[PDB]
Swiss-Prot record, chain A:
This is Small ribosomal subunit protein uS5. Is positioned such that it could physically interact with spectinomycin. InterPro entries: Ribosomal_Su5_D2-typ_SF, Ribosomal_uS5, Ribosomal_uS5_bac-type, Ribosomal_uS5_C, Ribosomal_uS5_N, Ribosomal_uS5_N_CS, Ribsml_uS5_D2-typ_fold_subgr. The gene is rpsE. Part of the 30S ribosomal subunit. Contacts proteins S4 and S8. It comes from Thermus thermophilus (strain ATCC 27634 / DSM 579 / HB8).
Swiss-Prot record, chain B:
Signal peptide: none annotated. It comes from the Bacteria. HAMAP family: Ribosomal_uS2_B. InterPro entries: Ribosomal_uS2 (IPR001865), Ribosomal_uS2_bac/mit/plastid (IPR005706), Ribosomal_uS2_CS (IPR018130), Ribosomal_uS2_flav_dom_sf (IPR023591). Belongs to the universal ribosomal protein uS2 family. This is Small ribosomal subunit protein uS2. It comes from Thermus thermophilus (strain ATCC 27634 / DSM 579 / HB8).
UniProtKB/Swiss-Prot annotation, chain C:
One of its GO terms (molecular function) is rRNA binding. Belongs to the universal ribosomal protein uS8 family. It comes from Thermus thermophilus (strain ATCC 27634 / DSM 579 / HB8). Keywords: Ribonucleoprotein, Ribosomal protein, RNA-binding, rRNA-binding. The keyword rRNA-binding applies. This is Small ribosomal subunit protein uS8. Pfam families: Ribosomal_S8.
Amino acid sequence: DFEEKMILIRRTARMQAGGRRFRFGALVVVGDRQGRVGLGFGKAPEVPLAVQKAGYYARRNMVEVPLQNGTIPHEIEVEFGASKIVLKPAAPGTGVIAGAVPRAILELAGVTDILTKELGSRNPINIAYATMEALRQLRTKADVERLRKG
Amino acid sequence: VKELLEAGVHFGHERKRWNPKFARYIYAERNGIHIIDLQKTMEELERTFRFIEDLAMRGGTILFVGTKKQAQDIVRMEAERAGMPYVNQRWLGGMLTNFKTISQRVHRLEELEALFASPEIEERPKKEQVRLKHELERLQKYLSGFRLLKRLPDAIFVVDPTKEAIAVREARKLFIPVIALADTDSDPDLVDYIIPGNDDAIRSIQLILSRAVDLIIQARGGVVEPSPSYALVQ
Amino acid sequence: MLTDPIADMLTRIRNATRVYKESTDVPASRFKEEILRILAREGFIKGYERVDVDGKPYLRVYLKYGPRRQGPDPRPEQVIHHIRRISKPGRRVYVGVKEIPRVRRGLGIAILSTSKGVLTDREARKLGVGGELICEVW
RNA sequence: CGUGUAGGCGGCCUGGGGCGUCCCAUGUGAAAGACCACGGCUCAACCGUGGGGGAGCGUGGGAUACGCUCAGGCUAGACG
RNA sequence: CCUGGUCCACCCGUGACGCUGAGGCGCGAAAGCGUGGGGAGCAAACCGGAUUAGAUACCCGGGUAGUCCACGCCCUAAACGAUGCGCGCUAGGUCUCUGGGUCUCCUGGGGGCCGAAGCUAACGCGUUAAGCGCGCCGCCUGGGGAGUACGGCCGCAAGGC
Ligand SMILES: [Mg+2]
Ligand SMILES: [Mg+2]
Ligand SMILES: [Mg+2]
Ligand SMILES: [Mg+2]
Ligand SMILES: [Mg+2]
Ligand SMILES: [Mg+2]
Ligand SMILES: [Mg+2]
Ligand SMILES: [Mg+2]
Ligand SMILES: [Mg+2]
Ligand SMILES: [Mg+2]
Ligand SMILES: [Mg+2]
Ligand SMILES: [Mg+2]
Ligand SMILES: [Mg+2]
Ligand SMILES: [Mg+2]
Ligand SMILES: [Mg+2]
Ligand SMILES: [Mg+2]
Ligand SMILES: [Mg+2]
Ligand SMILES: [Mg+2]
Ligand SMILES: [Mg+2]
Ligand SMILES: [Mg+2]
């Protein structure tokens, strides 16, 4: 068990003679607040069920966010298709400035002091997906020179 | 012992249908065929066994798979002859990654297994007899070897990795060590422990599977003679 | 006809690693060497050596990747994740010592020519100079 | 769609100049405003004092990797 | 007969003499225009015969410019790979054109198909990149208004930029 906050939920739909069937979507984040988080997307015939599946995959796929002072190691940019995200580390006592998507994800990941910018396609879903791969690719002075051994 | 055995009739395979990644593991192209460098096979058979053994002597189970006729039966033996689950028929999908479910069809095999020897058959109309029989038939058909350990194999050994790539993927996504015997028709990189050499002529498949299962039981006790292989072997 | 050989080299490398190749021979040059040296002296490579391909002098430059990996796409990480030329043949970029970039928050390097040898970010900033920002590596 | 004028861009090594480029010193960059501190009006707004900065540009000196220029050589581009 | 580009081979000659390219200049399908030839077939227009509610169409029988040639204009296009040019680098599988070799093989240029990695919004691209980079040119900045108006330049005009 971790935190588990719910990003957004939508009602989609398809066609079929007679009318339109349906489906709901659940994009969800999860994190103790120690440097561990997981994003999960859940589709299901009903609101609650979907929100459930959310957390399930959420916990399934999670990442080691190497914090530091409560901020972040280095500044990075990542593009996920059409949606691009900028993560830039702030000094203690700043705030977590971001949209609902990147902020939510960033809170449970721990961070308290981070500068963020949401460029490109601002597709909620895709921003999330983007935010993760960002963290995923975070390095510390350690694992840095850990590769420049030889 | 090995050099002569393998080189005897257990090296060199697929030709000009290769996969450039697997070149470090090749000597040349005699008469068209890609003949693999066996010398490197050893240094690779080594480490591989170095891993088999370090698992054999710690009692962790291995899922063997071979779904190709030229290498089917010879995996039904070496597996029974080392008490290791295996997959000889159609390697169904999500067996591993969707384990909590396929196991529901094993729990369905023993559902019939125990209603097999029972007084309930006195009844059950002929519509449920031909049925519940058949259902058991195929149930048994594909799950002859996939029952043993109701737990994810700490590894998986396999003939042609590209032939059963599906499986390789499942394991790969589940962080399971993957051992297998790949020819040129197979890409190294996505194999943890690699057995470079023939993958079609029943020769190299029995010679590598044997000493594979021969190194299995050499960390449990029971050093025996080889298992059934020759009956129509060419 | 190669407009800017350096930006070529860098790319030669960038393309090499992408599939994890042993070494790659970029045509030789004292300035390229100078640059290469700082990739080794700072450890983005095993290093480089002079060679020949018919009286024609390239430079064998041996890459350097990370540890193999668990899960799918077991391909290793890389020592050289991102290399891209700053000052370009069509937009020369210069900097006073105070302007000098701070690559990737201390984690990366910014090679750059100068009046007293090809330094790097820390190397110049400490040496107390500036010069043509050559590229950024990390 | 070509051809090509101006222009933009320029392969390998050696040397001279030091034009861009880089550093140091010095003059300049008024005051007011701004920003950091300290006090005056009961606080504040306003307001006084001090400090710290500012690219630019002139001058003197220094450096010579990359760009430029003059000089020498080469053959992987290009031509024959 | 006259003449362009182009590939290969030999490593011989020159010694960076390069790439690109605003404007300029040249070429530029078809239709169209001018003068003069030519005219079988075809065929805008045009005339009938059918169909049809009507049928200024589709189908049928006729048929003139034109389609052809000479010289001169016109300068458009789904002028399409809807993909500017040059150079370096980044798996291979297959068949095909055309060169060269101590020719079951190898290498060089070119035309295709599937595809690593990588790109891509997706479709797809993929050593003939839409990958990874540098140079230089051209171009886009919501739809309609409108490629219209005005001015300008060009053109016999139609019209073009
Ligand atoms: Mg993009
Ligand atoms: Mg010129
Ligand atoms: Mg000077
Ligand atoms: Mg002032
Ligand atoms: Mg000469
Ligand atoms: Mg040109
Ligand atoms: Mg024309
Ligand atoms: Mg015409
Ligand atoms: Mg005429
Ligand atoms: Mg007619
Ligand atoms: Mg007619
Ligand atoms: Mg076409
Ligand atoms: Mg062009
Ligand atoms: Mg070809
Ligand atoms: Mg293709
Ligand atoms: Mg090709
Ligand atoms: Mg408007
Ligand atoms: Mg318009
Ligand atoms: Mg028009
Ligand atoms: Mg007008």
